[PDB]
Amino acid sequence: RQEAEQLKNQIRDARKACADATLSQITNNIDPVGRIQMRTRRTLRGHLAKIYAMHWGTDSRLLVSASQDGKLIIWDSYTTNKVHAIPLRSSWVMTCAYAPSGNYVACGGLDNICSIYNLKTREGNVRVSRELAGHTGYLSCCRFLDDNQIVTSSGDTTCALWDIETGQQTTTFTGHTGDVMSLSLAPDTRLFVSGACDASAKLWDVREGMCRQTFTGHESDINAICFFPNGNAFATGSDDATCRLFDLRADQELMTYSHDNIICGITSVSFSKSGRLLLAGYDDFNCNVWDALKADRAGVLAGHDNRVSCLGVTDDGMAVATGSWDSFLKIWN
Amino acid sequence: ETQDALYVALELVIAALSVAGNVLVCAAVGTANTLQTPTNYFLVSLAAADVAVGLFAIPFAITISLGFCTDFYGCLFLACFVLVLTQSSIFSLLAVAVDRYLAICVPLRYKSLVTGTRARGVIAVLWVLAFGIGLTPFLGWNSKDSATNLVKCLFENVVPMSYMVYFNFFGCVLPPLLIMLVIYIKIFLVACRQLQRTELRTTLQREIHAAKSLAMIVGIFALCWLPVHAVNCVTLFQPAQGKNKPKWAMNMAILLSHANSVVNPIVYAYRNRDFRYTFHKIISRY
Amino acid sequence: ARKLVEQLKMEANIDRIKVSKAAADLMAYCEAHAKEDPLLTPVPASENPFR
Amino acid sequence: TVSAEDKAAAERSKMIEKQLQKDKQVYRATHRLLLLGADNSGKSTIVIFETKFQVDKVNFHMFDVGGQRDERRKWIQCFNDVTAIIFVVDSSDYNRLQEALNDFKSIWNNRWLRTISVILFLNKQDLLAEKVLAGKSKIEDYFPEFARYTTPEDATPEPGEDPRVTRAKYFIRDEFLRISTASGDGRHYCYPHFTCAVDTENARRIFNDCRDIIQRMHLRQYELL
Numbered sequence: 018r019q020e021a022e023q024l025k026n027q028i029r030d031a032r033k034a035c036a037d038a039t040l041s042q043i044t045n046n047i048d049p050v051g052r053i054q055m056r057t058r059r060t061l062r063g064h065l066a067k068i069y070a071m072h073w074g075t076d077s078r079l080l081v082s083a084s085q086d087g088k089l090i091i092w093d094s095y096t097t098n099k100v101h102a103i104p105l106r107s108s109w110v111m112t113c114a115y116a117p118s119g120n121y122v123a124c125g126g127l128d129n130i131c132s133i134y135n136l137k138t139r140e141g142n143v144r145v146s147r148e149l150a151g152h153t154g155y156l157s158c159c160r161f162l163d164d165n166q167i168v169t170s171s172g173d174t175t176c177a178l179w180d181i182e183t184g185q186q187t188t189t190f191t192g193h194t195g196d197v198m199s200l201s202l203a204p205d206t207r208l209f210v211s212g213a214c215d216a217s218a219k220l221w222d223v224r225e226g227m228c229r230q231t232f233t234g235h236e237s238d239i240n241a242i243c244f245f246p247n248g249n250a251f252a253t254g255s256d257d258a259t260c261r262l263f264d265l266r267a268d269q270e271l272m273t274y275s276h277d278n279i280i281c282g283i284t285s286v287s288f289s290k291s292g293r294l295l296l297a298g299y300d301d302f303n304c305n306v307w308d309a310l311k312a313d314r315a316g317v318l319a320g321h322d323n324r325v326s327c328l329g330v331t332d333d334g335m336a337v338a339t340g341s342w343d344s345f346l347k348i349w350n
Numbered sequence: 351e352t353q354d355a356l357y358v359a360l361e362l363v364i365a366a367l368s369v370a371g372n373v374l375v376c377a378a379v380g381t382a383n384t385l386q387t388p389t390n391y392f393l394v395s396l397a398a399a400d401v402a403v404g405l406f407a408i409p410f411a412i413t414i415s416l417g418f419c420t421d422f423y424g425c426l427f428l429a430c431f432v433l434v435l436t437q438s439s440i441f442s443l444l445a446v447a448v449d450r451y452l453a454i455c456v457p458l459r460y461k462s463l464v465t466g467t468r469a470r471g472v473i474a475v476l477w478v479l480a481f482g483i484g485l486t487p488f489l490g491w492n493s494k495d496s497a498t499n500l501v502k503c504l505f506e507n508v509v510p511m512s513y514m515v516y517f518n519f520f521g522c523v524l525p526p527l528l529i530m531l532v533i534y535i536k537i538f539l540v541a542c543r544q545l546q547r548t549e550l551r552t553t554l555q556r557e558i559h560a561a562k563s564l565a566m567i568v569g570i571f572a573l574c575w576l577p578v579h580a581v582n583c584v585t586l587f588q589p590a591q592g593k594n595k596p597k598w599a600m601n602m603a604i605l606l607s608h609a610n611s612v613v614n615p616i617v618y619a620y621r622n623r624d625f626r627y628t629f630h631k632i633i634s635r636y
Numbered sequence: 637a638r639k640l641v642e643q644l645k646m647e648a649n650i651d652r653i654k655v656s657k658a659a660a661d662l663m664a665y666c667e668a669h670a671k672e673d674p675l676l677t678p679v680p681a682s683e684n685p686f687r
Numbered sequence: 688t689v690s691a692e693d694k695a696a697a698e699r700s701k702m703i704e705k706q707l708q709k710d711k712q713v714y715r716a717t718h719r720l721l722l723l724g725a726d727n728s729g730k731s732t733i734v735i736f737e738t739k740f741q742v743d744k745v746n747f748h749m750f751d752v753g754g755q756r757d758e759r760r761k762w763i764q765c766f767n768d769v770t771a772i773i774f775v776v777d778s779s780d781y782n783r784l785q786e787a788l789n790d791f792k793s794i795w796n797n798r799w800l801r802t803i804s805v806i807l808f809l810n811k812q813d814l815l816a817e818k819v820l821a822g823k824s825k826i827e828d829y830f831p832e833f834a835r836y837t838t839p840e841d842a843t844p845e846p847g848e849d850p851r852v853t854r855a856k857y858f859i860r861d862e863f864l865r866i867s868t869a870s871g872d873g874r875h876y877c878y879p880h881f882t883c884a885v886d887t888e889n890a891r892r893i894f895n896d897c898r899d900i901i902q903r904m905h906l907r908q909y910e911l912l
């Protein structure tokens with residue numbers, strides 16, 4: 018009962034003990050990046066309602082988009098062609114995914130079921146391959162590990178690991194108090210982070226099944242999360258118009274990105290290929306570019322006429338795709 | 351020829367202003383994604399017709415009024431091309447009025463009835479009818495039998511007044527005016543009823559504001575178009591006072607009619623919220 | 637109940653390195669891979685697939 | 688210059704575009720309504736997750752989501768373009784009433800529903816009459832403002848009803864109307880209605896108060912209202 022306060026204070030001062038210096042005092046010598054200009058190379062049209070999710074492919078050529086009509090569309094990033102248009106059963110979906118092998122797609126929404134769609138079939142048509150029906154709340158985001166496993170985060174304060182062929186979940190993470198809104202994997206495919214609605218973040222283990230580290234420091238809802246290329250840091254965005262960078266091994270925060278002219282919230286966060294640029298999608302109808310090592314604005318990608326809800330960077334760093342609520346996609350380079 | 355030169359000067363000023371404003375409106379529509387609605391297609395058609403009047407009709411009208419000698423059909427060609435664009439603008443105004451009537455008096459079926467395909471078809475038929483109406487004189491409704499005085503280029507020496515009164519005025523102008531008047535009276539009554547419902551001294555103020563805003567549209571059209579067509583009827587129905595009339599009284603009348611091309615963007619386009627938002631965004635960004 | 641105080645125990649045993657070492661590692665990684673970031677430094681239009 | 692594979696892909700793209708164009712017309716000619724309420728309110732029988740009905744050759748689409756929990760501040764952002772929100776409340780249960788009022792306060796003041804109107808359905812009035820005629824009713828205990836309440840003269844009483852039933856009905860109506868007119872300025876309104884368990888006129892009511900909202904919006908967009 019009363020031991021929790023003592024343990025929390027012990028953690029609090031143990032974290033403070035290791036703090037030597039801030040990132041500002043160490044980064045005040047490197048040359049600034051400067052100013053970055055980006056233009057729209059391709060504009061993609063064909064949707065009717067708001068666009069909620071987007072995910073690039075492993076070959077940096079194909080991408081998939083999901084809207085409120087209950088329809089997934091697979092495009093071609095070069096020729097602006099359409100390859101597949103899969104209609105869904107439940108019109109309310111808020112996530113999508115692309116298999117690392119380019120053979121499967123994933124979807125989910127308020128219908129509380131995770132749907133797996135097969136692309137490379139022997140008949141030329143697309144049919145539902147498997148449906149996962151274990152959660153008791155609306156799905157938030159799902160990600161792939163291989164062609165046989167998937168990780169889902171839903172609104173019942175839980176996260177789940179599934180097996181496609183067997184059909185039933187194998188591990189459940191139950192360490193949160195509010196509904197989880199975002200999660201991100203790691204390059205080594207052994208750990209993954211999660212951000213919930215209780216103004217906190219957690220790091221989990223795939224095979225151990227238990228939480229390892231928890232992080233706090235935000236004042237309100239945490240919307241989107243990402244992962245650093247090296248695997249020792251992650252970025253978080255909140256409705257406080259605030260981004261925060263969290264290191265893995267020191268168990269602390271390193272830098273905070275914010276400004277006095279930004280009142281709205283944050284919907285999406287992504288990194289660059291080298292870990293030098295941090296792209297953020299705000300609610301003031303335009304995005305922002307931050308330098309992850311100096312906390313200085315580099316440019317504004319203001320080309321949308323509504324809220325921005327999508328963001329993604331290719332595996333080679335070629336271009337960045339942005340969706341929005343006006344049924345349009347844009348590719349910046 | 352001081353009055354004649356002044357007429358040409360004001361015609362040139364009006365043409366320049368009309369082309370500037372309507373090209374601005376068309377460019378604003380073309381480069382905005384959120385402005386591609388079926389309602390705005392009619393506004394684009396009106397702006398295009400006004401551009402056509404400004405760039406082509408005014409020089410042709412000045413050339414006709416100059417008064418030099420040439421052939422018959424060449425001089426009729428200018429008059430026909432002058433007529434067609436004005437008729438197209440007249441029809442576009444009626445199309446916009448009908449669109450607003452459908453938007454207000456039948457709200458639940460507005461989307462199922464007005465779409466892009468039907469708007470495009472309506473515009474195509476409306477522009478074809480203008481060409482059909484303006485090309486009637488070439489079918490034989492001419493004055494080559496008298497051949498005027500090889501013929502001096504005046505409007506009255508090619509196109510007869512019977513065509514201007516019986517066919518054009520009573521057939522292609524007045525019924526549109528009646529339809530717009532009826533539509534706007536109905537819209538005003540519908541607005542007044544909902545104002546009464548929502549209110550339950552300010553209510554009368556809002557009613558007066560709505561009445562003024564609705565009446566100005568019809569007033570501008572009537573003041574721009576009636577004087578030109580009144581003189582033709584006066585000349586045809588009674589020739590006594592028509593034969594001895596001031597020479598300038600016609601010219602100003604013609605000018606007034608072309609003024610309708612420069613007022614239309616302000617009344618219809620600039621007042622709308624979407625156009626103001628697009629203009630503000632473009633000005634701020636650039 | 638007792639599960640929260642039970643869970644906090646393993647969170648207590650984690651050892652922590654200094655912030656300077658992590659910052660230096662971040663600096664080294666960012667400076668090492670700066671030659672293969674098309675977004676940070678533009679590439680010639682000949683090899684650009686978006687044009 | 689263009690290989691066969693590119694043209695083969697272009698043909699498939701054209702077919703997909705044609706199918707999407709076909710679907711757009713069907714999508715754009717439907718009015719969407721969001722149904723909300725609590726348990727033991729009778730939302731199941733008004734007109735389990737989706738419903739489609741048409742009246743006077745006008746289509747409608749009703750969504751009823753109930754797999755979530757009491758908190759709804761997250762997924763309410765999706766329905767920022769629906770035509771109207773139907774709210775169904777009960778009148779027989781007196782103690783589980785104030786909570787319902789609070790629920791209404793949650794919807795009327797949400798930041799994502801500023802320009803969305805609400806149609807209110809007070810249900811289970813046959814039970815209300817039987818409970819108010821009997822002596823078990825203790826309205827003054829739960830609500831002590833009802834004792835001094837007076838019957839409104841602007842009401843339209845149904846002939847054959849005792850005055851006590853009219854007072855009981857109109858007190859509950861005015862309780863919600865107070866919250867309705869407490870906030871909001873010319874952006875959304877509330878339409879009260881009295882609905883029984885086996886009423887058959889709900890579709891016409893929804894049709895009328897759905898026509899009114901669209902008329903008001905169209906009048907507002909031209910700056911006349």
Ligand SMILES: N#Cc1c(N)nc(SCC(N)=O)c(C#N)c1-c1ccc(OCC2CC2)cc1
Pocket residue numbers: 411414415432433436437440505506514518523582600601604607
């Ligand atoms: N009538 C006449 C007339 C005319 N006696 N002279 C000239 S020009 C030589 C001049 N300065 O007088 C012109 C010209 N332009 C006209 C004219 C102008 C507009 C018209 O649209 C009618 C509207 C319904 C579609 C028809 C005719």
